[PDB]
Amino acid sequence: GLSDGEWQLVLNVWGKVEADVAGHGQEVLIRLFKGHPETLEKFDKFKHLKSEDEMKASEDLKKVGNRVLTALGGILKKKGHHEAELTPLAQSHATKHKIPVKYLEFISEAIIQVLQSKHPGDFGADAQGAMSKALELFRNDMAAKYKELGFQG
Ligand code: HEM
C-alpha cells in the first residue's frame, strides 16, 4: 500500500527509535493515557496511576512500553510481509487484552506525535504520511485477524 520510498522514510525514522526503544515506548504510553484516559483501564498493573509523574516513575509502564515498540518495529521492518509477526499479537489482543481497533488508532496517533516531537529532522511531511499509512495497514490487518477470532473490534 506503501511504495519503497515510503518504507524508506519509515525505516529512517525507526533508526532513531532503535537507540532507545524503552524511553520511546514509555513516552508513547504517557501520551496515550493523557489523551485518552479510558485506555489506562486496560492495564491492570498500573491502572491506579493518576499522574504523569507517577507514570514516569513506573518501571512496569516502561517495560511494557518497551515490549510494545519492540514488537511494532519488528512488524514495520517486514514492509508489509508481517503475517507471522502479527498472528501472535492479534491472538492475545483479541482474547486476553481485548483491545478495540479504536484503541490501536489512538496509539497510532500518539506514535506519530512523539516522533514529530523528538525527530522533526527525520520526520518531515512525507515521512509523517508514510508512517500514517503503515500504521493504518497494521490496524487493517489486526482488524482482519480479529474478525476471524470472533472479536468484534
Ligand atoms: C502498536 C500497537 C501495539 C502493539 C504492537 C502491542 C504489542 C504488545 C505486546 C508485544 C505485548 C506483550 C505480549 C502480549 O500480551 O501480546 C502487549 C501487551 C499488552 N498490550 Fe498491547 N500492543 C499494542 C497496543 C496496545 C493498546 C493500544 C493497548 C490498550 C489500550 C494494549 C494493551 C495491552 C495490554 C493490557 C497488555 C498486557 C500488559 C501487561 O503485561 O500488563 N496494547 N502489547
**Strand, helix or coil at 47?**
coil
What total number of domains does the chain contain? 1
Closest atom of ligand 1 relative to the 89 alpha carbon? 16
Identify the residue whose cell numbers are 532507545: 20
Q: What technique determined this structure?
A: X-ray
Instruction: Please state, in angstroms and rounded to a whole number, the distance separating the CA atoms of residues 8 and 147.
Output: 31
Tell me which residue has its CA closest to atom 12 in ligand 1: 67
Q: Where are the alpha helices (DSSP H) in 2-124?
A: 4-17, 21-35, 52-57, 59-76, 83-95, 101-118
Closest atom of ligand 1 relative to the 107 alpha carbon? 27
For 41, the domain range is 1-153
Q: In 16-31, which positions are buried (b, 16+ CB within 10 angstroms) versus exposed (e)?
A: ebeeebeebbbbbbbb
Which CATH number is 130's domain given? Answer: 1.10.490.10
Instruction: Give the angle subtended at the CA of 138 by the CAs of 136 and 142, to the nearest 5°.
Output: 115
What is the structure's resolution, reported in angstroms to one decimal? Answer: 2.3
